[PDB]
Symmetry: D2
């Protein structure tokens, strides 16, 4: 779980996986065998990002492969979030109502979004993001734009329309012209 | 895209990958080299599931590896579903309002669910399913049960609570006792 | 038979996921619910590739997702191969007998593993014949003789003379050719595609 | 330096995904937004493993997700190794010099690839010494001599006598031991962990 206990275990596995003893690995890093042994005893807590990049280099792998997963925040498979546990965040316009996330699925980023603008001309595109995205119009009408922001594709979405946006596809939302505001629920995954 | 064009191409790749010529592969299947060549020309459309299992066996792989992906139903990254394109389905109680799906992410199964019962004693558990699951209480109160149906864990979820259910975790929903009915939006992914 | 069983189980799983009962799927397919029940009861054996594609399509997924993995052909996690039992296959590129593939152990538990002793017959690097790269990553070892390897752009390749004991890695889709070193007659590779 | 750059880029990506600005993250971490901007400007080099874990935790993900892949050490998709350049390492299990590992080519583009010529020094199958299985799948080839292989439950193992040219596959975590065939002195394996 802790960075240094995950790292200690993974480091020993990797080192062994490539047949190095403490001495060999130590030679490659400007440390003693006793120091490398210490990292493997959970004493790597102070290693810098740069040093970690070097350890990962000499063992022909990534920092990823030497550090633990995000962890387990689940009560027997479940995490719950109560309505007023959420934070409210800005545009830069949208207002974000962040719903339940979990380290057992870091991709899951579900939001309730209030869409403050109803002037499709003001649509602020994002350059497309890392996961796929399910969306559902909660209240009102959404004017959606996607693809190339130069020559976009557009759609008018009444209340209760659902839509999917593939990863890295640039997109933008606004309420339908002169309808004031709409509400989206978004599930990035 | 079509089953037989995907299969034709994948079959040729696999056969070549394991160094077999048409003759060699044919010997293993009770066909002529000319017949195997035909499959590789898109003429495998009539092959049975059982025959496909055999082809996959002799090439030391799965039917999966020899057939195309689900396909692409996206208009430049996006698919949209209008409110009244959805089907309404039964319990066996819940009423399902199936939202937008896509072959580019077959796991995505988003639903609006009406929960018809408000007697937690009547909760019908499912044995847990294949994907992860995000849920959001749309209207009313949900009495949720999960884990072992013998000795379950339970939670009361007010309107606008969000929850995550890990894959294969058995779970059941009902409205809070004597509250009539509630609405969930579920996103299986 | 295990194919029909795995399909039966994965058909039921997928149908339940999209919230369709026997009737809904059966209608979307122009079948009776009994037939679909039958399929889900191990009776899908005779369905065609084309019918399977239809089923996968209606279910918004792939035939692959509805079919079981390649099975387990291991004996407590191990499969062995004795030198006598190797499939031997020819490698002809023009009309020229270029390689002889001696096929090493393979297993349905790691389908992409394709190891080989490759007899490298030609020894004139000038007539080296490129593949167009292939799907797997590849580990290679000079087993006997000396090898003249070419890779990358066939017009202007990178090159290496590799003696007995040399080892190389070729990343997927990277095009490559081998002959024995000019005038040495023949050489041998262990190639491990994974 | 490429570590700090990749972190900088992946930190910004992740922060934007969870909809936090510089201020929100900075506060959740007891830092100023300027420091977080600095991190996102390639200045994260000196952050500790522990600080990284905190950052990953607040961002509900893993350090791995915030750090770049192992780089590319290939020359147009190929890396070669000449027999002279092999790392040589000893394999001692009790006080006994059991194996000699000659390390073959490896690459950051397929970190799990670990090929070896293994010199098998012992030739008394009775004193065969098991590992506890390991992470990768493994392909093996009898390079020289004859091998006595044991696998599975060390109390009651499965076994194989394998002559020169035999090939085997060992699935991950399956425990296994090798010696040379009783009384033949020594043998050689090519082992390819992948
Ligand atoms: C993530 C929710 O769709 C909005 P964004 O992608 O515009 O932030
Ligand atoms: C999928 C939606 O959660 C409900 P179920 O899992 O009870 O069908
Ligand atoms: C496997 C040996 O490299 C050759 P090929 O990949 O062209 O067959
Ligand atoms: C790699 C050779 O099999 C032995 P080891 O895995 O025990 O080192
Ligand atoms: Zn988005
Ligand atoms: Zn569910
Ligand atoms: Zn090759
Ligand atoms: Zn091993």
């Amino acid at each position: 779980k802790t960075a240094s206990t995950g790292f200690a275990e993974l480091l020993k596995d990797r080192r062994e996986q490539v047949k190095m003893d403490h001495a060999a690995l130590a030679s490659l890093l400007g440390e003693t065998p006793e120091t490398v042994a210490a990292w493997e005893n959970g004493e790597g807590g102070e290693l810098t990002l740069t040093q970690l990049g070097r350890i990962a280099h000499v063992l022909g792998t990534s920092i990823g492969a030497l550090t633990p997963p995000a962890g387990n925040d689940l009560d027997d498979g479940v995490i719950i979030q109560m309505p007023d546990e959420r934070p409210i965040l800005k545009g830069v316009y949208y207002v974000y109502n962040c719903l339940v996330r979990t380290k057992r699925a870091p991709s899951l980023v579900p939001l309730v979004v209030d869409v403050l603008t109803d002037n499709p001309d003001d649509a602020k595109f994002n350059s497309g993001h890392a996961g796929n995205e399910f969306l559902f119009v909660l209240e009102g009408e959404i004017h959606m734009k996607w693809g190339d922001k130069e020559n976009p594709k557009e759609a008018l979405l009444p209340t209760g329309a659902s839509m999917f946006v593939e990863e890295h596809v640039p997109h933008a939302f606004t309420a339908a012209k002169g309808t004031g505001s709409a509400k989206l629920i978004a599930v990035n995954f």
